[PDB]
Coordinates of C-alpha atoms and ligand atoms in Angstrom, one line a residue:
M1 CA 0.0 0.0 0.0
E2 CA 2.9 2.4 0.9
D3 CA 4.6 1.6 -2.4
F4 CA 1.2 1.9 -4.3
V5 CA 0.6 5.4 -3.0
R6 CA 4.1 6.6 -3.8
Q7 CA 3.7 5.5 -7.4
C8 CA 0.0 6.4 -7.8
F9 CA 0.1 10.1 -6.7
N10 CA 2.6 12.7 -7.8
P11 CA 5.6 13.4 -5.4
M12 CA 4.3 16.9 -4.4
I13 CA 1.0 15.4 -3.2
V14 CA 2.9 12.5 -1.4
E15 CA 5.3 15.1 0.1
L16 CA 2.3 17.2 1.4
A17 CA 0.6 14.0 2.8
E18 CA 3.7 13.0 4.7
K19 CA 4.1 16.4 6.2
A20 CA 0.4 16.4 7.1
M21 CA 0.8 13.1 8.9
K22 CA 4.1 14.0 10.5
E23 CA 2.6 17.3 11.9
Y24 CA 0.2 14.9 13.8
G25 CA 3.0 12.5 14.7
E26 CA 1.7 9.5 12.7
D27 CA 3.8 7.1 10.6
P28 CA 2.8 6.8 6.9
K29 CA 4.7 3.5 6.8
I30 CA 2.4 2.1 9.4
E31 CA -0.9 3.9 8.8
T32 CA -0.9 3.4 5.1
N33 CA -4.7 3.6 4.6
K34 CA -4.8 7.1 6.1
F35 CA -1.8 7.9 3.9
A36 CA -3.8 6.9 0.8
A37 CA -6.9 8.8 2.0
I38 CA -4.9 11.9 2.6
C39 CA -3.2 11.9 -0.9
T40 CA -6.6 11.1 -2.5
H41 CA -8.3 14.1 -0.7
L42 CA -5.4 16.4 -1.7
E43 CA -5.5 15.3 -5.3
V44 CA -9.3 15.9 -5.4
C45 CA -8.8 19.4 -3.8
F46 CA -6.3 20.3 -6.6
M47 CA -8.4 18.9 -9.4
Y48 CA -11.3 20.9 -8.0
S49 CA -9.4 24.2 -7.8
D50 CA -8.3 23.6 -11.4
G51 CA -12.0 23.0 -12.5
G52 CA -12.8 26.7 -12.4
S53 CA -11.8 29.8 -14.2
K54 CA -8.1 30.7 -13.5
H55 CA -8.4 32.7 -10.3
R56 CA -11.6 31.3 -8.8
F57 CA -10.3 29.4 -6.0
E58 CA -8.1 30.2 -3.0
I59 CA -6.5 26.9 -2.0
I60 CA -6.5 26.5 1.8
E61 CA -5.8 22.8 2.2
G62 CA -2.2 21.5 1.7
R63 CA -0.8 24.6 3.5
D64 CA 0.8 24.7 6.9
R65 CA -1.9 25.5 9.5
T66 CA -0.8 28.9 10.6
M67 CA -0.5 30.3 7.0
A68 CA -3.9 28.6 6.2
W69 CA -5.5 30.6 9.0
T70 CA -3.8 33.9 7.9
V71 CA -5.4 33.4 4.4
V72 CA -8.8 32.6 5.8
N73 CA -8.5 35.7 8.0
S74 CA -7.6 37.7 5.0
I75 CA -10.6 36.5 3.0
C76 CA -13.0 37.0 5.9
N77 CA -11.9 40.6 6.6
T78 CA -12.0 41.5 2.9
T79 CA -15.3 39.8 1.9
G80 CA -17.4 40.1 5.0
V81 CA -17.9 36.3 5.2
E82 CA -18.0 34.8 8.7
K83 CA -14.9 33.0 10.0
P84 CA -15.3 29.2 9.9
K85 CA -14.5 27.3 13.1
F86 CA -12.5 24.7 11.3
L87 CA -10.1 25.0 8.4
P88 CA -12.0 24.5 5.1
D89 CA -10.3 23.3 1.9
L90 CA -11.0 26.1 -0.6
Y91 CA -12.5 29.5 -1.0
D92 CA -14.6 30.3 -4.1
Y93 CA -14.1 33.8 -5.3
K94 CA -17.1 33.6 -7.7
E95 CA -19.7 32.4 -5.2
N96 CA -18.2 34.1 -2.1
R97 CA -18.0 31.0 0.0
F98 CA -15.7 28.5 1.6
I99 CA -15.8 24.9 0.5
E100 CA -15.2 21.7 2.4
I101 CA -14.4 18.8 0.1
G102 CA -15.0 15.3 1.4
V103 CA -14.0 12.0 -0.1
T104 CA -15.6 8.8 1.3
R105 CA -15.5 5.1 0.8
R106 CA -18.9 4.9 2.5
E107 CA -22.2 6.6 1.6
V108 CA -22.1 10.2 0.4
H109 CA -25.0 11.3 2.5
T110 CA -23.7 9.8 5.7
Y111 CA -20.3 11.6 5.2
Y112 CA -22.1 14.8 4.2
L113 CA -24.1 14.8 7.5
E114 CA -21.0 14.2 9.6
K115 CA -19.3 17.1 7.9
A116 CA -22.4 19.4 8.2
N117 CA -22.8 18.8 12.0
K118 CA -19.1 19.1 12.8
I119 CA -18.9 22.6 11.2
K120 CA -22.3 23.9 12.3
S121 CA -22.0 26.6 9.6
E122 CA -24.7 27.7 7.2
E123 CA -22.2 29.5 5.0
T124 CA -19.5 26.9 4.2
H125 CA -20.5 24.9 1.1
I126 CA -19.9 21.1 1.4
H127 CA -19.1 18.8 -1.5
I128 CA -18.6 15.1 -1.1
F129 CA -17.3 12.7 -3.6
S130 CA -17.3 8.9 -3.3
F131 CA -15.2 6.2 -4.9
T132 CA -18.4 5.0 -6.7
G133 CA -19.2 7.9 -8.9
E134 CA -21.7 9.8 -6.7
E135 CA -21.5 13.3 -5.3
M136 CA -23.6 15.3 -2.9
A137 CA -23.3 19.1 -2.4
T138 CA -25.1 21.6 -0.3
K139 CA -28.3 22.7 -1.9
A140 CA -27.5 20.5 -4.8
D141 CA -25.2 23.3 -6.0
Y142 CA -22.2 21.5 -7.5
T143 CA -20.1 24.6 -8.1
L144 CA -18.2 23.3 -11.1
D145 CA -19.5 22.2 -14.5
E146 CA -20.3 18.5 -15.1
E147 CA -17.1 18.0 -17.1
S148 CA -14.8 19.0 -14.2
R149 CA -16.8 16.9 -11.7
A150 CA -16.8 13.9 -14.0
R151 CA -13.0 14.0 -14.4
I152 CA -12.7 13.7 -10.6
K153 CA -15.2 10.9 -10.4
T154 CA -13.2 9.0 -13.1
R155 CA -9.9 9.5 -11.3
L156 CA -11.5 8.2 -8.0
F157 CA -12.8 5.1 -9.7
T158 CA -9.4 4.5 -11.2
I159 CA -7.8 4.6 -7.7
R160 CA -10.4 2.0 -6.5
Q161 CA -9.6 -0.4 -9.4
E162 CA -5.8 0.0 -9.0
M163 CA -6.3 -0.7 -5.3
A164 CA -8.6 -3.8 -5.9
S165 CA -6.2 -5.3 -8.5
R166 CA -3.5 -5.2 -5.8
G167 CA -5.8 -6.6 -3.1
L168 CA -5.8 -3.3 -1.1
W169 CA -9.3 -2.0 -1.7
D170 CA -11.2 -4.1 0.9
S171 CA -8.9 -2.9 3.8
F172 CA -9.1 0.6 2.4
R173 CA -13.0 0.6 2.2
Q174 CA -13.4 -1.1 5.6
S175 CA -10.9 1.3 7.3
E176 CA -13.1 4.4 7.2
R177 CA -15.7 3.1 9.6
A178 CA -12.9 2.1 12.0
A179 CA -11.5 5.6 11.8
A180 CA -14.9 7.0 12.6
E181 CA -15.4 4.6 15.5
Ligands
581_201 C1 -10.9 10.5 4.4 C2 -10.4 11.3 3.2 O1 -10.0 10.8 2.2 N1 -10.3 12.5 3.5 C3 -9.4 12.8 4.4 C4 -8.7 14.0 4.5 C5 -7.9 14.1 5.6 C6 -7.8 13.1 6.6 C7 -8.5 12.0 6.5 C8 -8.5 10.9 7.4 N2 -8.6 9.6 7.0 C9 -8.6 8.5 7.8 C10 -8.7 7.1 7.4 O2 -8.2 6.2 8.0 O3 -9.4 6.9 6.4 C11 -8.5 8.9 9.2 O4 -8.4 7.9 10.1 C12 -8.3 10.3 9.6 O5 -8.2 10.5 10.8 N3 -8.4 11.2 8.7 C13 -9.3 11.8 5.4
581_202 C1 -14.6 11.6 9.3 C2 -13.8 10.6 8.6 O1 -14.3 9.5 8.2 N1 -12.5 10.8 8.3 C3 -11.8 11.9 8.7 C4 -11.3 12.0 10.0 C5 -10.6 13.2 10.4 C6 -10.4 14.2 9.5 C7 -10.9 14.1 8.2 C8 -10.7 15.2 7.2 N2 -9.9 16.3 7.6 C9 -9.7 17.4 6.8 C10 -8.8 18.4 7.2 O2 -8.7 19.5 6.6 O3 -8.1 18.1 8.2 C11 -10.5 17.4 5.5 O4 -10.5 18.4 4.6 C12 -11.4 16.3 5.2 O5 -12.1 16.2 4.2 N3 -11.4 15.3 6.1 C13 -11.6 13.0 7.8
MN203 MN1 -9.2 20.2 4.9
MN204 MN1 -11.8 18.2 3.2

């Protein structure tokens, strides 16, 4: 699984996933499923940011925490939007909202509701993808065009297959419930 991740995702994403795990004192060598999930989520976040017109999205995720807060602060003080209680993943300049991107090996609506109650925010848009082609977004407002969302769905289903063909998918799918509980 470790070797799969390092050859499945680009080095910059891997690099960012390792740092993110190290900042919490976890070992990517041991917790390989979380390592995969982190890289996947990052990859989705960057695909998403790319889905829009050139300067539409501020990227919050993938940054060191402190600088991430500084940027959020800057957007809040300059747009009027309320300060979220937790770090979101992006800010949409077109729609004037933050976005939380979720990626789940379980049901989109279950994950959506976990996100929505943790944040307790009526401003932050939530957008969940699954490894089975579905998506759920706040108010059924998907933000991007179908083309950009479709590319992401395809990439996720390709990760699932490459996992399965290596015997890694079961453990990866099962793992999320364990993480939750
Ligand atoms: C789950 C996912 O792909 N998104 C995402 C982003 C950042 C972190 C995690 C995450 N993923 C797992 C996991 O094992 O799946 C955890 O146990 C955990 O604490 N966090 C997941
Ligand atoms: C709830 C769950 O199943 N996994 C999990 C656990 C802890 C954290 C995260 C997570 N964490 C972040 C984060 O920014 O830390 C995300 O953007 C995200 O989508 N998911 C996901
Ligand atoms: Mn995040
Ligand atoms: Mn997220």
